Design a protein around this nucleic acid. Sequence first.
DNA 1: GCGGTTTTTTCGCGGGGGTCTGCGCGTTCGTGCGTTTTTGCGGTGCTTGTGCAAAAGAGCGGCCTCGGCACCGGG
Length: 75
Amino acid sequence: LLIRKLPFQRLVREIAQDFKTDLRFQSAAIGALQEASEAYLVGLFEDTNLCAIHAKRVTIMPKDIQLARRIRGER
DNA sequence: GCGGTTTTTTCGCGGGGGTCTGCGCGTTCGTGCGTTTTTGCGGTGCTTGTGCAAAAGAGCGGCCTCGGCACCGGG
């Protein structure tokens, strides 16, 4: 895993702090969340690279991300 | 639901060195200048055709009196 394990834990807790106050986490929940997040982001970067190559470029730009999320059907 | 075991999460500290960052020059790729090949709406001259004053005689149709006859009623 490329992201670390403690900043990601803090991010997850911060996000979870909105839906219910003072929620405990479990052995393999944060690990699964990190695996899913990194897999998702790698797929998104694959699609972004495809779009950037389509535009005859090598640099990925935010509009490529936006196009990828639009075609995937993401809101 | 309640008691058990014991893993691996949370807690804190020290050290390393890869990653971030200040600084410079160059270039490659982003942006504007100019153009290629073609599509489209703009108009015309000409073709082909349209709706908007008596006088007089001659001739005529209707008509009417009349001629003349056949006919009903009776013996």
